[PDB]
Design a binder for this molecule. Structure first.
Ligand SMILES: [Zn+2]
Lengths: 39, 171, 48, 187
């Protein structure tokens, strides 16, 4: 929505920090699966 | 004026009459004379006598006359302290400063005498709410610690992390 | 935003401040943002 | 509900939050669950005034809320918001909050150990003792700044080391009531 995200199952605002926390936990293997070179 | 103007003057005169200090109970006839509305219709007299003069939150019937509820009105430091104390004990919450100032002239004298025992909350409409300072569990910290406290985020975290933060050290 | 957050300003104020910062950052990258106004140089000319 | 939990909540709210938060929390402490409309009428706060406070107590998850629905005497639907204190999440979040301060304090302590000692009065730049061989000019026989071509001082480096310790040390001294309340509530 505009420049921000929403999560709905019941709807919440998804902040960049929450996304950062989630992404920081993602592993190298998951990055390769996602097609992103972790290095 | 014969409809609302007369009854409004009854309400306004009685309300202002209390501000003069004449807390003694009054009758509609006395107010009708003081307002010169003796010509108000019989149906209006009985209606005001049975509704307007009894349903107001500050008016109570005493020995058949109407009074400004002297027990509710705060007119001294002890009453102010006791009311806030009892209200806090019962969890009733705070009381608007205007209710005391309307009851006790220059309420600030009683308020300033109690001082820190009275907690002042300012509403968005600039009105002040008075609360009892129950010192059962009191604690305060330095600005550096209040600054330190404000610096740490709490909402933008996962529940798993909130629980994980505990176990990181092995507990 | 730094002072507002460090001072612990209201959540809606900080949120609006972050929303404005988010718009400026995005605008610096791309001015052709969808559903958003063009950033003018205060004289009717859009900033590249 | 052990009194230690009530006292802990009262101490932390009064210690780091305004009386509005304490008064609002006291209601949820005096009664485990209270309606938002009741708290609103009890506190006499405005909707946004109380809601923002409740949002903060929601942000740190010190309180929980559930919605209850019933039909009024006239037949219209009614939806009341029931708020309640969650000592479990409260103790967990305060432990995190304090553990984060510990990490910040440890970071501030480590910074107090890493702070630069030499400094230039012209550009107001402080240089670490590792640069001493670079700052010392044998042509001059003294320390100088490359950017300012001016004398660099060192003896003032005692001030930041001493001063920082005073602020950081007192943090543990004052937090003692919360630590004791925590030790008493670890179960
Ligand atoms: Zn210099």
């Amino acid at each position: 929505s505009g420049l921000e995200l929403y999560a709905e199952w019941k709807k919440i605002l998804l902040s960049p920090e929450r996304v950062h926390e989630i992404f920081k936990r993602i592993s190298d293997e998951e990055c390769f699966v996602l097609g992103m070179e972790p290095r | 004026g014969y409809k609302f103007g007369v009854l409004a003057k009854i309400v306004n005169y009685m309300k202002t009459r209390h501000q003069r200090g004449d807390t003694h109970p009054l009758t509609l006839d006395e107010i009708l004379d003081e307002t010169q509305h003796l010509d108000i219709g019989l149906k209006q007299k009985q209606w005001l006598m049975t509704e307007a003069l009894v349903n107001n939150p500050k008016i109570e019937v005493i020995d058949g006359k109407y009074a400004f509820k002297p027990k509710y009105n705060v007119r001294d430091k002890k009453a102010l302290l006791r009311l806030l104390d009892q209200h806090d004990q019962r969890g009733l919450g705070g009381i608007l400063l205007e209710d005391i100032e309307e009851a006790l002239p220059n309420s600030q004298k009683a308020v300033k005498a109690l001082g820190d025992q009275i907690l002042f909350v300012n509403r968005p409409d600039k009105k002040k709410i008075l609360f009892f300072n129950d010192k059962s569990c009191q604690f305060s910290v330095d600005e550096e610690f209040q600054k330190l406290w404000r610096s740490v985020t709490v909402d933008s975290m996962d529940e798993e992390k909130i629980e994980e933060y505990l176990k990181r050290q092995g507990i | 935003l730094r002072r507002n957050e460090q001072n612990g300003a209201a959540a809606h104020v900080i949120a609006e401040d972050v929303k404005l910062l988010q718009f400026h950052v995005a605008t610096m990258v791309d001015n052709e943002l969808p559903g958003l106004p063009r950033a003018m140089q205060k004289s009717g000319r859009p900033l590249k | 509900v052990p009194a230690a939990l009530k006292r802990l909540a009262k101490y932390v709210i009064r210690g780091f939050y305004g009386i509005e938060h304490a008064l609002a929390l006291d209601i949820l402490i005096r009664n485990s669950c209270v309606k938002e409309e009741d708290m609103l009428e009890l506190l006499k706060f405005d909707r946004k005034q109380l809601r923002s406070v409740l949002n903060n107590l929601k942000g740190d998850k010190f309180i929980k809320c559930r919605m209850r629905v019933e039909t009024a005497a006239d037949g219209k639907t009614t939806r009341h918001n029931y708020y309640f204190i969650n000592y479990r999440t409260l103790v967990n979040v305060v432990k995190y909050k304090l553990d984060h301060m510990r990490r910040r304090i440890e970071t501030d302590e480590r910074d107090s150990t890493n702070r630069a000692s030499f400094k230039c009065p012209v550009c107001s730049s402080t240089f670490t003792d590792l640069e001493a061989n670079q700052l010392f000019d044998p042509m001059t026989g003294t320390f100088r700044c490359t950017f300012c071509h001016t004398e660099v001082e060192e003896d003032e480096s005692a001030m930041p080391k001493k001063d920082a310790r005073t602020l950081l040390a007192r943090f543990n001294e004052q937090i003692e009531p919360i630590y004791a309340l925590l030790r008493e509530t670890e179960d």
